[PDB]
Design a protein around this ligand. Structure first.
Ligand SMILES: CSC[C@H]1O[C@@H](n2cnc3c(N)ncnc32)[C@H](O)[C@@H]1O
Ligand SMILES: CSC[C@H]1O[C@@H](n2cnc3c(N)ncnc32)[C@H](O)[C@@H]1O
Lengths: 281, 281
């Protein structure tokens, strides 16, 4: 058999590899190179521009922590936006909340959505739900023009090289502030503390120029570089996102596999060197 | 340049890689294949039987969490044993505690110690300290025969394939119980929750047959498979290891880079699926 290897200038000098059981689909879309393969031990894998976006084995960690952290704080969220997330994993998790009335998702690349509906049915299943509305657009323009405001915004982007380029700057962070209700929350993929500290600091900076409270949490997931990824957590109220206001006991949450009430708060207890690094921002 | 790749039947289907800047030393010792290289981005790397034991960039996470978790619980530890740990990183961390009177280290492979003194001076520096006494022996025999008992025992082994084979069974866990003071503690490398759950369960089982309290914590470290590794935490008293009894404010701890009072407790908040898995043991 052959191996798939994730190399990149975003993490020079290291690489992670998965053995290929078979290749399922490749194409160049209007925006990126898309690849889907069945791996030998992590199930099906979705790759964009040579970078792993998710795998069946572990995607639950990133989708549950990105969704349930803010959703368990926000008191009763009605209208939620997902940026990116074309695979639909965030949507799967949002659909578990019966109080939610509307879910918009703004994804730039329709190919991702359709590939996901074809090859990842357990991740894409939430596109069925009547509450879900899809927009094919650079979120960067979509937030410039949207008339509604949201209780929660969840920015499940790819990395800063590619179309996600426009999502990692100050102007993008204004657009989010404005598209949120006065007591709204944003969570955003914010990379690995083991190698991206300059970025993490920039991101935090941007958010601070607008939000009164910016926190950072960490998620263990094996198929992202260095085995972890961070959530940049933004709050307009001063009490932030580190503690849930509810517990997921509805039968729709019985199945959860990573997130729980305690490990919500735990994810915000970071290594000394990182705290040290993000003090004077 | 060329790449070093960590493959193994212990984690089929995945691999992590580091680019080689230069190879420093190779040999077959009486017990294992030893390799040391300078990597391009993680500094110097020590490899035994094709498996990464440590790197300069990140070793602090595993050595600080393995040392300071139990040492901050144990009320005033006098006599401490390290099993394995020939590189000396655990010793470096123990030497920071002035109340410690004696540190024994039982390592099977002297080549590791001497390689470490030669090529890893900032990790091996604690061999200088007058309190440190070295024994070259299978810890499995050494614990059968030792007359003293210890406040704390820290089992910094390599993986179960190799000489560490004898350290991952029930009989080994008896030997530790007996070599500990009545209110003593053991911490032991116990692998990744992302792929070793059968082992984790076995280990926990073994420990439970003797200790009244067995906890498991997790450490983010990029150069071990799946980016994390676990500490099996054993206690003879019923209150366990999840909360420190002291804070590291002596000037000798100013330099710490991962461990702190809060993230001590955080490391014990595990993913739902893992709790679920280790309930009826
Ligand atoms: C798979 S989750 C990451 C998703 O983010 C999407 N993405 C990247 N950049 C943007 C953008 N500017 N707007 C919306 N979605 C984006 C990618 O196409 C991918 O589907
Ligand atoms: C580098 S830390 C891991 C150390 O554990 C050592 N080790 C492996 N098995 C044993 C054993 N049975 N007794 C003592 N040390 C061991 C290895 O030789 C290595 O130096």
């Amino acid at each position: 058999k052959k191996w798939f290897s994730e190399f990149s200038i975003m993490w020079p000098g290291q690489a992670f590899s998965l053995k290929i059981k078979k290749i399922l689909y490749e194409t160049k879309s209007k925006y990126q190179n898309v690849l889907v393969f069945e791996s030998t031990t992590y199930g099906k894998v979705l790759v964009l521009d040579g970078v792993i976006q998710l795998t069946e084995k572990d995607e639950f960690a990133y989708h549950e922590m990105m969704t349930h952290v803010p959703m368990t704080v926000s008191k009763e969220p009605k209208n939620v936006l997902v940026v990116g997330g074309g695979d639909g994993g965030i949507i799967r998790e949002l659909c578990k909340y019966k109080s939610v009335e509307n879910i918009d998702i703004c994804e730039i690349d329709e190919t991702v959505i359709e590939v996901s509906k074809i090859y990842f049915k357990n991740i894409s299943c939430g596109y069925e739900d009547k509450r879900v509305n899809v927009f094919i657009e650079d979120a960067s323009k979509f937030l410039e023009n949207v008339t509604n405001t949201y209780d929660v915004i969840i920015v499940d982007s790819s990395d800063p090289i590619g179309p996600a380029e426009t999502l990692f700057n100050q102007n993008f962070y204004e657009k989010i502030y404005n598209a949120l209700k006065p007591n709204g929350y944003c969570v955003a993929q914010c990379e690995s503390l083991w190698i991206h500290v300059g970025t993490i600091k920039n991101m935090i900076g941007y958010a601070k120029k607008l939000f009164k409270k910016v926190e950072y949490a960490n998620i263990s997931i094996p198929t992202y570089p260095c085995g972890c990824i961070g959530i940049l957590c933004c709050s307009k109220t001063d009490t932030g996102l580190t503690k849930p206001n509810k517990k997921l006991e509805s039968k729709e949450f019985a199945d959860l596999k990573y997130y729980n009430y305690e490990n919500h708060s735990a994810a915000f207890k970071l290594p000394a060197f990182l705290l040290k690094e993000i003090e004077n921002i």
